[PDB]
Coordinates of C-alpha atoms and ligand atoms in Angstrom, one line a residue:
Chain Q
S1 CA 45.2 118.9 327.3
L2 CA 46.0 116.4 324.6
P3 CA 44.0 116.3 321.4
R4 CA 42.0 113.4 319.9
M5 CA 44.5 110.5 319.4
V6 CA 44.3 107.2 317.7
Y7 CA 46.1 104.3 319.4
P8 CA 45.4 100.7 320.7
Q9 CA 43.6 100.4 324.0
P10 CA 45.7 99.4 327.0
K11 CA 44.4 96.1 328.5
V12 CA 44.3 95.7 332.3
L13 CA 44.6 91.9 332.1
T14 CA 47.5 91.9 329.6
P15 CA 50.9 92.5 331.2
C16 CA 53.3 94.7 329.2
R17 CA 56.4 92.6 330.0
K18 CA 56.4 89.3 331.8
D19 CA 60.1 88.6 331.8
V20 CA 61.3 91.7 333.8
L21 CA 60.4 94.1 336.7
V22 CA 58.7 97.2 335.3
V23 CA 58.1 99.3 338.5
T24 CA 60.2 99.8 341.7
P25 CA 58.9 99.3 345.3
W26 CA 58.6 103.1 345.5
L27 CA 56.4 103.1 342.4
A28 CA 59.0 104.5 339.8
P29 CA 58.7 103.1 336.3
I30 CA 61.5 101.0 334.9
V31 CA 61.9 101.8 331.2
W32 CA 61.9 98.7 328.9
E33 CA 60.8 98.3 325.3
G34 CA 57.0 97.6 325.3
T35 CA 56.3 99.6 328.4
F36 CA 55.5 102.9 326.6
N37 CA 53.5 104.3 323.8
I38 CA 55.9 106.8 322.3
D39 CA 53.3 108.8 320.4
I40 CA 51.3 109.7 323.6
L41 CA 54.6 110.6 325.3
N42 CA 55.8 112.7 322.3
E43 CA 52.6 114.8 322.3
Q44 CA 52.6 115.4 326.1
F45 CA 56.1 116.7 326.0
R46 CA 55.6 118.8 322.8
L47 CA 52.7 120.6 324.4
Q48 CA 55.0 122.0 327.0
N49 CA 57.6 123.0 324.4
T50 CA 60.2 120.9 326.2
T51 CA 63.9 121.6 325.8
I52 CA 66.5 118.9 326.7
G53 CA 70.1 119.7 327.7
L54 CA 72.7 117.0 326.9
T55 CA 76.2 117.3 328.5
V56 CA 79.4 115.5 327.5
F57 CA 83.0 115.8 328.5
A58 CA 85.5 115.5 325.7
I59 CA 88.9 116.4 327.0
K60 CA 92.3 115.4 325.7
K61 CA 92.2 112.4 323.3
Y62 CA 88.4 112.1 324.0
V63 CA 87.6 114.8 321.4
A64 CA 87.9 112.1 318.8
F65 CA 84.7 110.4 320.0
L66 CA 82.5 113.5 319.3
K67 CA 81.9 113.1 315.6
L68 CA 80.2 109.7 315.9
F69 CA 78.5 110.7 319.1
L70 CA 76.9 113.8 317.6
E71 CA 76.1 112.2 314.3
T72 CA 74.3 109.3 316.0
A73 CA 72.6 111.6 318.5
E74 CA 71.1 113.5 315.5
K75 CA 69.6 110.2 314.3
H76 CA 68.3 108.8 317.6
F77 CA 68.3 111.3 320.6
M78 CA 65.0 113.2 321.3
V79 CA 64.2 113.5 317.6
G80 CA 61.2 115.8 317.1
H81 CA 62.0 117.9 320.2
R82 CA 64.3 120.8 321.1
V83 CA 67.9 119.8 322.1
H84 CA 70.8 121.8 323.5
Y85 CA 74.1 120.1 323.4
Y86 CA 76.8 121.2 325.9
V87 CA 80.4 120.2 325.2
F88 CA 83.0 120.6 327.9
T89 CA 86.4 120.6 326.2
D90 CA 89.9 122.1 326.2
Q91 CA 90.2 121.8 322.4
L92 CA 87.6 124.2 320.8
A93 CA 89.0 123.8 317.2
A94 CA 88.8 120.0 317.4
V95 CA 85.0 120.0 317.8
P96 CA 83.7 118.6 314.5
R97 CA 81.5 120.6 312.2
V98 CA 78.1 118.8 312.4
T99 CA 74.8 119.6 310.7
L100 CA 72.0 119.9 313.3
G101 CA 68.3 119.7 312.7
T102 CA 65.7 122.4 313.5
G103 CA 65.4 123.3 317.2
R104 CA 68.8 121.8 317.9
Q105 CA 71.8 123.8 319.0
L106 CA 75.3 123.4 320.4
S107 CA 77.4 125.3 322.9
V108 CA 81.0 124.6 323.6
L109 CA 82.2 125.3 327.2
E110 CA 86.0 125.8 327.2
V111 CA 87.4 124.4 330.5
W112 CA 94.3 113.7 340.0
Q113 CA 91.8 114.8 342.7
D114 CA 90.7 117.8 340.6
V115 CA 90.1 115.3 337.7
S116 CA 88.0 113.0 340.0
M117 CA 85.8 115.9 341.3
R118 CA 85.6 117.7 337.9
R119 CA 82.4 116.1 336.5
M120 CA 80.2 116.7 339.6
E121 CA 81.7 120.1 340.3
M122 CA 81.3 121.3 336.7
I123 CA 77.7 120.2 336.1
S124 CA 76.6 121.7 339.5
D125 CA 78.5 125.0 338.8
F126 CA 77.0 125.3 335.3
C127 CA 73.5 124.5 336.5
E128 CA 73.5 128.0 338.2
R129 CA 75.5 129.6 335.5
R130 CA 73.5 128.5 332.4
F131 CA 71.3 125.4 332.7
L132 CA 68.5 126.7 334.9
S133 CA 67.9 129.5 332.4
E134 CA 68.3 127.5 329.2
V135 CA 66.9 124.0 329.5
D136 CA 64.0 122.2 331.3
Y137 CA 65.8 118.8 331.7
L138 CA 69.4 117.8 331.9
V139 CA 70.9 114.5 330.6
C140 CA 74.5 113.7 331.4
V141 CA 76.4 110.9 329.5
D142 CA 79.9 109.7 328.5
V143 CA 81.1 110.6 325.0
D144 CA 82.9 107.4 324.0
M145 CA 79.5 105.9 323.0
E146 CA 77.2 105.7 320.0
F147 CA 73.4 105.8 319.5
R148 CA 72.0 102.9 317.5
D149 CA 68.3 103.1 318.4
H150 CA 65.6 105.3 320.0
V151 CA 66.4 107.3 323.1
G152 CA 63.6 109.8 323.7
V153 CA 61.2 111.5 326.1
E154 CA 60.2 108.2 327.8
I155 CA 63.3 108.8 330.0
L156 CA 62.2 112.3 331.1
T157 CA 61.3 112.7 334.8
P158 CA 62.4 114.8 337.9
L159 CA 65.3 112.4 338.6
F160 CA 66.7 109.2 337.0
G161 CA 69.6 106.7 337.1
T162 CA 70.6 103.9 334.8
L163 CA 71.4 100.2 335.6
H164 CA 75.0 99.1 335.2
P165 CA 74.9 96.5 332.4
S166 CA 77.2 94.1 334.3
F167 CA 75.1 94.1 337.5
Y168 CA 71.4 94.3 336.6
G169 CA 70.8 90.7 337.6
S170 CA 73.2 90.7 340.6
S171 CA 72.3 90.6 344.3
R172 CA 73.0 93.6 346.6
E173 CA 75.9 92.0 348.6
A174 CA 77.8 91.6 345.2
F175 CA 77.4 95.3 344.3
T176 CA 80.7 97.2 344.2
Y177 CA 79.4 100.0 346.6
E178 CA 82.0 101.7 348.8
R179 CA 82.2 99.4 352.0
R180 CA 84.4 101.4 354.4
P181 CA 82.4 103.2 357.1
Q182 CA 85.0 106.0 357.2
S183 CA 83.8 107.2 353.7
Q184 CA 80.6 109.3 353.1
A185 CA 79.7 106.9 350.2
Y186 CA 79.5 103.9 352.6
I187 CA 76.7 101.4 352.0
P188 CA 76.5 98.2 354.2
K189 CA 75.6 94.8 352.8
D190 CA 72.0 94.8 354.1
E191 CA 71.2 98.0 352.1
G192 CA 70.9 98.9 348.4
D193 CA 68.4 98.7 345.6
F194 CA 70.4 98.7 342.3
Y195 CA 73.9 99.5 341.1
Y196 CA 73.6 102.7 339.0
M197 CA 76.3 103.4 336.4
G198 CA 77.9 106.9 336.4
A199 CA 77.8 107.1 332.6
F200 CA 74.1 107.9 332.3
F201 CA 71.9 110.0 334.7
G202 CA 69.6 113.0 334.7
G203 CA 66.4 114.8 335.7
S204 CA 65.1 118.4 336.1
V205 CA 67.9 120.9 336.3
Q206 CA 67.0 121.5 340.0
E207 CA 67.3 117.8 340.9
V208 CA 70.5 117.3 338.8
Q209 CA 72.0 120.4 340.5
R210 CA 71.1 118.9 343.9
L211 CA 72.6 115.5 343.1
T212 CA 75.8 116.8 341.6
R213 CA 76.3 119.4 344.4
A214 CA 75.7 116.7 347.0
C215 CA 78.2 114.3 345.5
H216 CA 80.9 117.0 345.4
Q217 CA 80.3 118.0 349.0
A218 CA 80.7 114.4 350.2
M219 CA 83.8 113.9 348.0
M220 CA 85.4 117.0 349.7
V221 CA 84.6 115.6 353.1
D222 CA 86.2 112.3 352.1
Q223 CA 89.3 114.2 350.9
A224 CA 89.4 116.0 354.3
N225 CA 89.1 112.7 356.1
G226 CA 92.0 111.3 354.0
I227 CA 89.9 108.7 352.1
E228 CA 89.0 108.1 348.5
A229 CA 86.0 106.0 347.4
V230 CA 86.6 102.8 345.5
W231 CA 84.8 103.9 342.2
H232 CA 85.1 107.6 342.8
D233 CA 82.0 109.7 341.9
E234 CA 80.1 106.6 340.9
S235 CA 80.2 105.4 344.5
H236 CA 78.8 108.7 345.7
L237 CA 76.1 108.6 343.0
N238 CA 74.9 105.2 344.3
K239 CA 74.9 106.5 348.0
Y240 CA 72.8 109.5 346.8
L241 CA 70.2 107.5 344.9
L242 CA 69.8 105.1 347.8
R243 CA 68.5 107.9 350.1
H244 CA 66.9 110.0 347.3
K245 CA 64.9 107.5 345.2
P246 CA 64.9 108.1 341.4
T247 CA 61.4 108.8 339.9
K248 CA 62.4 106.6 336.9
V249 CA 65.1 103.9 336.4
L250 CA 66.3 103.1 332.9
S251 CA 67.1 99.5 331.8
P252 CA 70.5 98.4 330.4
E253 CA 68.9 98.9 327.0
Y254 CA 70.2 102.4 327.6
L255 CA 73.8 101.5 328.5
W256 CA 75.3 98.5 326.8
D257 CA 78.6 96.9 325.8
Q258 CA 78.0 94.3 323.1
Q259 CA 81.7 93.1 322.9
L260 CA 81.5 92.2 326.6
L261 CA 78.0 90.9 326.9
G262 CA 76.6 90.2 323.4
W263 CA 72.9 90.5 322.6
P264 CA 70.7 88.5 325.0
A265 CA 67.0 88.0 324.4
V266 CA 66.1 90.1 327.5
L267 CA 67.2 93.2 325.5
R268 CA 64.8 93.8 322.7
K269 CA 66.7 97.0 321.6
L270 CA 70.3 98.0 321.9
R271 CA 69.9 101.8 322.2
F272 CA 73.1 103.3 323.5
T273 CA 76.3 101.3 323.4
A274 CA 80.0 101.5 324.3
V275 CA 82.5 102.2 321.5
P276 CA 85.5 99.7 321.6
Chain R
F1 CA 59.1 116.9 346.7
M2 CA 62.3 114.8 346.8
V3 CA 63.0 113.9 350.4
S4 CA 66.1 112.4 352.0
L5 CA 65.6 109.0 353.6
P6 CA 67.4 107.4 356.6
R7 CA 69.0 103.9 356.8
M8 CA 66.2 101.4 356.1
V9 CA 66.1 97.6 356.2
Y10 CA 64.0 95.8 353.6
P11 CA 64.3 93.1 350.9
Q12 CA 66.1 93.8 347.6
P13 CA 64.0 94.3 344.4
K14 CA 64.9 92.0 341.6
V15 CA 65.1 93.3 338.0
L16 CA 64.6 89.9 336.4
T17 CA 61.6 89.0 338.6
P18 CA 58.3 90.4 337.3
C19 CA 56.1 92.4 339.7
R20 CA 52.8 90.8 338.9
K21 CA 52.5 88.3 336.0
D22 CA 48.7 88.6 335.7
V23 CA 48.1 92.3 335.5
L24 CA 49.3 95.5 333.8
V25 CA 51.1 97.5 336.5
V26 CA 52.1 100.5 334.4
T27 CA 50.1 102.5 331.8
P28 CA 51.3 103.3 328.2
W29 CA 52.2 106.8 329.6
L30 CA 54.3 105.3 332.4
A31 CA 51.9 105.9 335.3
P32 CA 51.8 103.1 337.9
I33 CA 48.6 101.1 338.2
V34 CA 48.4 100.5 341.9
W35 CA 47.9 96.8 342.7
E36 CA 48.8 94.9 345.9
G37 CA 52.4 93.7 345.6
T38 CA 53.6 96.8 343.5
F39 CA 54.6 98.9 346.5
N40 CA 56.6 98.6 349.7
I41 CA 54.6 100.7 352.3
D42 CA 57.5 101.0 354.7
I43 CA 59.5 103.1 352.3
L44 CA 56.5 105.2 351.1
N45 CA 55.4 106.0 354.7
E46 CA 58.8 107.3 355.6
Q47 CA 58.9 109.4 352.4
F48 CA 55.6 111.0 353.2
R49 CA 56.3 111.4 357.0
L50 CA 59.4 113.4 356.1
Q51 CA 57.1 115.8 354.3
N52 CA 54.8 116.1 357.4
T53 CA 51.9 115.5 355.0
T54 CA 48.3 116.2 355.8
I55 CA 45.6 114.4 353.8
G56 CA 42.1 115.9 353.3
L57 CA 39.1 113.5 352.9
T58 CA 35.8 114.8 351.6
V59 CA 32.4 113.1 351.9
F60 CA 28.9 114.5 351.0
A61 CA 26.1 113.4 353.4
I62 CA 23.0 115.3 352.4
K63 CA 19.5 114.4 353.7
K64 CA 19.1 110.7 354.2
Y65 CA 22.8 109.9 353.3
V66 CA 23.8 111.2 356.8
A67 CA 23.0 107.7 358.1
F68 CA 26.1 106.3 356.2
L69 CA 28.5 108.5 358.2
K70 CA 29.1 106.4 361.4
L71 CA 30.3 103.3 359.5
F72 CA 32.4 105.4 357.1
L73 CA 34.2 107.3 359.8
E74 CA 34.8 104.3 362.1
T75 CA 36.3 102.2 359.3
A76 CA 38.3 105.1 358.0
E77 CA 39.9 105.5 361.5
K78 CA 41.0 101.8 361.2
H79 CA 42.2 101.8 357.6
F80 CA 42.6 105.3 355.9
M81 CA 46.1 106.9 356.1
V82 CA 46.8 105.4 359.6
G83 CA 49.9 106.9 361.0
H84 CA 49.5 110.2 359.1
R85 CA 47.7 113.5 359.7
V86 CA 44.1 113.4 358.4
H87 CA 41.5 116.2 358.1
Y88 CA 38.0 114.9 357.5
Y89 CA 35.6 117.4 355.8
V90 CA 31.9 116.5 356.0
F91 CA 29.5 118.4 353.7
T92 CA 26.1 118.1 355.2
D93 CA 22.7 119.8 355.7
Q94 CA 22.5 118.4 359.3
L95 CA 25.5 119.3 361.5
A96 CA 23.9 117.8 364.6
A97 CA 23.3 114.4 362.9
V98 CA 27.0 113.8 362.5
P99 CA 27.9 110.9 364.8
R100 CA 30.2 111.2 367.9
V101 CA 33.4 109.4 366.9
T102 CA 36.7 109.1 368.7
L103 CA 39.6 110.3 366.5
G104 CA 43.3 109.3 366.8
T105 CA 46.2 111.7 367.3
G106 CA 46.7 114.0 364.3
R107 CA 43.1 113.5 363.2
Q108 CA 40.4 116.2 363.1
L109 CA 36.9 116.8 361.7
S110 CA 35.2 119.9 360.4
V111 CA 31.6 120.2 359.2
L112 CA 31.0 122.2 356.1
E113 CA 27.5 123.7 356.3
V114 CA 25.8 123.7 352.9
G115 CA 22.2 123.9 351.6
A116 CA 20.2 120.9 350.4
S117 CA 23.8 117.3 340.3
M118 CA 26.4 119.9 339.7
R119 CA 26.7 120.2 343.5
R120 CA 29.7 118.2 344.4
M121 CA 32.1 119.5 341.7
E122 CA 31.3 123.2 342.4
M123 CA 31.4 122.8 346.2
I124 CA 34.8 121.0 346.3
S125 CA 36.2 123.7 343.9
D126 CA 34.8 126.5 346.1
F127 CA 36.2 125.1 349.4
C128 CA 39.6 124.7 347.9
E129 CA 39.9 128.5 348.0
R130 CA 38.1 128.9 351.4
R131 CA 39.7 126.1 353.5
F132 CA 41.6 123.3 351.7
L133 CA 44.6 125.2 350.1
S134 CA 45.8 126.4 353.5
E135 CA 44.9 123.3 355.6
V136 CA 46.0 120.2 353.6
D137 CA 48.6 119.0 351.0
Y138 CA 46.4 116.4 349.2
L139 CA 42.7 116.0 348.6
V140 CA 40.9 112.6 348.4
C141 CA 37.2 112.8 347.3
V142 CA 34.9 109.8 347.9
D143 CA 31.3 108.6 348.1
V144 CA 29.9 108.2 351.7
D145 CA 27.8 105.1 351.2
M146 CA 31.0 103.0 351.5
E147 CA 33.1 101.2 354.1
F148 CA 36.8 100.6 354.5
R149 CA 37.8 96.9 354.8
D150 CA 41.6 97.0 354.2
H151 CA 44.6 99.4 353.8
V152 CA 44.2 102.6 351.8
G153 CA 47.4 104.7 352.3
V154 CA 50.1 107.0 350.9
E155 CA 50.6 104.7 347.9
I156 CA 47.7 106.5 346.2
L157 CA 49.1 110.0 346.6
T158 CA 50.4 111.7 343.5
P159 CA 49.5 115.0 341.7
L160 CA 46.5 113.4 339.9
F161 CA 44.7 110.0 340.2
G162 CA 41.6 108.1 339.0
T163 CA 40.2 104.7 339.9
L164 CA 39.1 101.9 337.6
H165 CA 35.4 101.1 337.6
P166 CA 34.9 97.5 339.0
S167 CA 32.4 96.7 336.2
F168 CA 34.7 97.7 333.3
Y169 CA 38.3 96.9 334.0
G170 CA 38.2 93.9 331.7
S171 CA 36.0 95.5 329.0
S172 CA 37.0 96.9 325.5
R173 CA 36.7 100.6 325.0
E174 CA 33.5 100.2 322.8
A175 CA 31.7 98.8 325.9
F176 CA 32.6 101.8 328.1
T177 CA 29.6 103.9 329.1
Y178 CA 31.1 107.2 328.0
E179 CA 28.8 110.0 326.9
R180 CA 28.3 109.2 323.2
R181 CA 26.3 112.2 321.8
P182 CA 28.7 114.7 320.0
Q183 CA 26.6 117.6 321.3
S184 CA 27.9 117.0 324.9
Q185 CA 31.1 118.4 326.3
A186 CA 31.7 114.9 327.8
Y187 CA 31.5 113.2 324.3
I188 CA 34.0 110.5 323.5
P189 CA 33.9 108.5 320.2
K190 CA 34.1 104.7 320.1
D191 CA 37.8 104.6 318.9
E192 CA 39.0 106.7 321.8
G193 CA 39.5 106.0 325.6
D194 CA 42.1 104.3 327.9
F195 CA 39.9 103.3 330.9
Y196 CA 36.5 103.9 332.4
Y197 CA 37.1 105.7 335.7
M198 CA 34.5 105.7 338.5
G199 CA 33.2 109.0 340.0
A200 CA 33.2 107.6 343.5
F201 CA 37.0 107.8 344.1
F202 CA 39.4 110.5 342.8
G203 CA 41.9 113.0 344.1
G204 CA 45.5 114.3 344.0
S205 CA 47.2 117.6 345.0
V206 CA 44.8 120.4 346.1
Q207 CA 45.9 122.5 343.0
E208 CA 45.2 119.6 340.6
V209 CA 41.9 118.7 342.2
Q210 CA 40.8 122.4 342.3
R211 CA 41.5 122.5 338.6
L212 CA 39.7 119.2 337.8
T213 CA 36.5 120.0 339.8
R214 CA 36.5 123.5 338.4
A215 CA 36.7 122.3 334.8
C216 CA 34.1 119.6 335.3
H217 CA 31.7 122.1 336.8
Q218 CA 31.9 124.7 333.9
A219 CA 31.7 121.8 331.4
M220 CA 28.4 120.7 333.0
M221 CA 27.2 124.4 332.8
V222 CA 27.8 124.5 329.1
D223 CA 25.7 121.2 328.7
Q224 CA 23.0 122.8 330.8
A225 CA 22.8 125.8 328.5
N226 CA 22.4 123.4 325.5
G227 CA 19.5 121.5 327.3
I228 CA 21.5 118.3 327.6
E229 CA 22.4 116.0 330.6
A230 CA 25.3 113.6 330.4
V231 CA 24.4 109.9 330.7
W232 CA 26.3 109.4 334.0
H233 CA 26.4 113.1 335.1
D234 CA 29.6 114.2 336.9
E235 CA 31.2 110.7 336.1
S236 CA 30.8 111.4 332.3
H237 CA 32.7 114.7 332.6
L238 CA 35.3 113.1 334.9
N239 CA 36.1 110.5 332.2
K240 CA 36.4 113.2 329.4
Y241 CA 38.8 115.2 331.7
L242 CA 41.0 112.2 332.5
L243 CA 41.3 111.1 328.8
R244 CA 42.7 114.5 327.9
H245 CA 44.6 115.1 331.2
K246 CA 46.3 111.7 331.9
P247 CA 46.4 110.8 335.6
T248 CA 49.8 110.3 337.3
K249 CA 48.5 107.2 339.0
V250 CA 45.6 104.8 338.3
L251 CA 44.1 102.8 341.2
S252 CA 43.1 99.2 340.6
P253 CA 39.6 97.7 341.4
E254 CA 41.0 96.9 344.9
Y255 CA 40.2 100.5 345.7
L256 CA 36.6 100.5 344.6
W257 CA 34.7 97.1 344.7
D258 CA 31.2 95.7 345.0
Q259 CA 31.2 92.1 346.2
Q260 CA 27.4 91.6 346.0
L261 CA 27.5 92.4 342.2
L262 CA 31.0 90.9 341.3
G263 CA 32.2 88.4 343.9
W264 CA 35.9 87.9 344.6
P265 CA 38.1 87.1 341.5
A266 CA 41.7 85.7 341.8
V267 CA 43.4 88.9 340.5
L268 CA 42.0 90.8 343.5
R269 CA 44.4 90.1 346.4
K270 CA 42.6 92.5 348.7
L271 CA 39.3 94.5 348.9
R272 CA 40.0 97.8 350.5
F273 CA 37.1 100.2 349.9
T274 CA 33.7 98.6 349.2
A275 CA 30.0 99.4 348.5
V276 CA 27.4 99.1 351.4
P277 CA 24.7 96.6 350.7
Ligands
UDP1 O1 20.9 113.0 348.5 C1 22.1 112.8 348.3 C2 22.5 112.3 347.1 C3 23.9 111.9 347.1 N1 24.8 112.4 348.0 C4 26.2 112.2 347.8 O2 26.5 111.9 346.4 C5 27.2 110.7 346.3 C6 26.8 109.9 345.0 O3 25.4 109.5 345.0 P1 25.1 107.9 344.9 O4 25.9 107.1 345.9 O5 23.6 107.7 345.1 O6 25.5 107.5 343.4 P2 25.9 106.0 343.0 O7 27.3 105.9 342.7 O8 25.5 105.0 344.1 O9 25.1 105.6 341.8 C7 26.8 109.9 347.5 O10 27.8 109.0 347.9 C8 26.7 111.0 348.6 O11 28.0 111.2 349.1 C9 24.3 112.9 349.2 O12 25.0 113.2 350.1 N2 22.9 113.1 349.4
MN2 MN1 27.9 105.8 345.9

C-alpha cells in the first residue's frame, strides 16, 4: 500500500512516446525516457526494502576500468536503494578504494573454451552459493563502461534483456543470430524479435539462475557436438530470450557507444555508455 | 510463471514504429493498458496453454437478474477465453432458473447456492477459500446484465487488473466520482487519482482477488459502523484500493462499453463486452 502521493494525472488520450514502440507483442514494457514516473516506482520498491545485486567481471587488464565504473555507479545506479556490488577478479589488491553511500556494500569474489563459458557458469554457480540468500534482483553488466545518467528501479522485473545499440532498427534477417542448425543457439531467418546484447541483462535471482544455467548447458552440448556459436554466449542468450520472453526490454538508452553512433534525437538520455 | 515456447511464425515487432499513435498504451508505473493492436494473441495463447490454465468467471444473478443469464452464457461460449479451460460460477437464489446451455470441451458450470450491498465482495472472498483456490488459477469477476460481442482472452490475465469506466476515460481527476467525504474509508481528495475504474469488470490471480475483495468488504464494514454509505458503494471502495495498490494491467473501454449512452468513437477499434439495453 502506497501513501498519499502528489504527481500529474496520466492522460488516456495523450501517448507517452509517439516516435518509438513502448510495449512488446507479449505485453512487456519497453523502457524509454518519458514512459515512467520515477517517484511512484521509487516508493513501490522502497516499500519492499528491495536489494539489488550488480555483478561485474574485471580480470587481467580489465581491473583498470573499476574506479570509473564504481564512482559513476555511486552517482547514477539505483540511488536511494540498497545495492550489493559483486566483483569477480583475480587481482584483489588492485580493486580501488571507493567510498560507498548508506545501504551500499561491495564483495570481491576471487576467481579459451573455459573463458567463453566463464560468465554463464560463474553467475549460475554463485546464484546458488550467495545470490539467492543475499539479493532480490540481479543485474549483470560489462565493466568497461561508465554511468552518465539515471539507471534505476524502472528496469526491475522478473527477467529483462537490452537492445544492441547497432541493431535496434534492423530487421530480423539482418540480425547476427547463430544460423547453423547443428548448434543449440540456431535461429532461422523467419524467427526472432530483437537482437539482445550480452553486455546488459537481469531479473529475479531465480530467473537469472535459470537463464545462465540454460546457456551453459547448451554451450556444453555445442562443445560436445564439435561446434562453437558465432558470438559465443551472446548467441545462446538470444536463443534463450526467443523462447522465454523477457518481462521488460530496455532501450539502447541503457547501452550506448557515442564514438560509433553519436547522439541521435531518438535518445533523450545517454545513460550507460562504452568507454573508448 | 516463465514458460518455454516452441518455434512460432509471426511478424517481427518494430522498435521505431509506435504501437498506437492515438492512445496511452502503458501507465506511469509501467503496466500495459490493453488496447486492440497492443498484443499478439497467438503468442499469448501458447504461453497460457503451456501452463494448462483454468479461468474462473463469477456472475451474480439474484432475484430478477436471473433473466440475464441465458444471453450472458451463450455469448461467453462464443467469445470468453475460447480454446482454454473455463469454470463458470453462478451465484443465484434460484438454481432451477439457470438456463440449459451447451458448453464446449474443457468448460463447466457450478451453481453457488446463496440467500437473497456488501454482498458481492464478501461472497467472492468466502468462496475463494471454499472452492476457487483449489479449482482455478485466475478469477474474473463481472456484472451479469451484459453481453459478449468480441474477443475477451488471456491478454487480460495478470496478477491484478482494473477496467476504465467508459464515461471517464477522457476526464480530468477532478471530474472523477470518487468518494469525497474524508469520513469514509473510500475517501480520495481532488489532487489524487490515476483513473476511475468500473466495478463491473475486475480480476486477477485468486490470491490477489481474495485479498482485494476481503479488504473492500472490511472497509465497507468500518463505514457501516460510522453510519456512512459510499456514493458508489463497492465501486468507491474498489477505486480507493486500486489507487493504493496499483494494478499490473489496465483494460481499456473496449472491455466495458455502453453504445446507447456513448456511441462508437474512432479510438475504439472493437467493442468486446457491452451493456444490455
Ligand atoms: O438484485 C440484484 C441486484 C444486483 N445483482 C448483481 O449485482 C450487479 C450490479 O448491479 P447493477 O447491474 O444493477 O449495477 P449497475 O452497474 O447497473 O449500476 C448485477 O450485475 C448483478 O450481477 C443481482 O444479481 N441481483
Ligand atoms: Mn451492471
